[PDB]
Nucleic acid binder design. Structure first.
Length: 109
RNA sequence: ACGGAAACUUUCGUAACUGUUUAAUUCUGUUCACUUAUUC
């Protein structure tokens, strides 16, 4: 009737990425867009907005039936997984992500 | 050298007792700080 499925995993980075954050003040040697971190502490963290915006794009190009043009209006077979602000049959999404935090500080030092 | 002369409709007493503009309601549904790039 109503179940809760939590996909707990550990994202391992094999190659250093580069995602721009807010302002260019993460250190004393920046000149371009740095990396988003934590407003309280000083640990490089990755938000959850970049995961939904990238996984949906790479998935809607093989599981679709029509050439897309605008978001929330392509491939109805997967629109119920992320959401749709135009279809009256559903509005809320059934896939809630989470801002991944760096928990590798217990053995990095 | 008047059917006149003498004289408070006056004294007393809250329009009063009682009583929620109340019950119900996410300012949210879609959204990578991105694209091209030999520290040689």
């Amino acid at each position: 009737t109503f179940a809760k499925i939590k996909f707990s995993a550990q994202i391992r980075l094999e190659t250093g990425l580069h995602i721009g954050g807010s302002d260019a003040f993460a250190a004393i040697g920046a000149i371009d867009s740095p990396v988003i971190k934590d407003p309280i502490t000083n640990i490089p963290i990755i938000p959850g907005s970049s995961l939904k915006g990238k996984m949906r794009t790479l998935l809607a190009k093989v599981y679709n039936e029509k050439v897309a043009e605008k978001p929330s209006d392509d491939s109805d077979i997967l629109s119920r997984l992320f959401g749709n602000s135009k279809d009256k049959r559903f509005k809320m999404g059934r896939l809630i992500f989470r801002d991944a935090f760096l928990s590798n500080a217990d053995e990095l030092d």
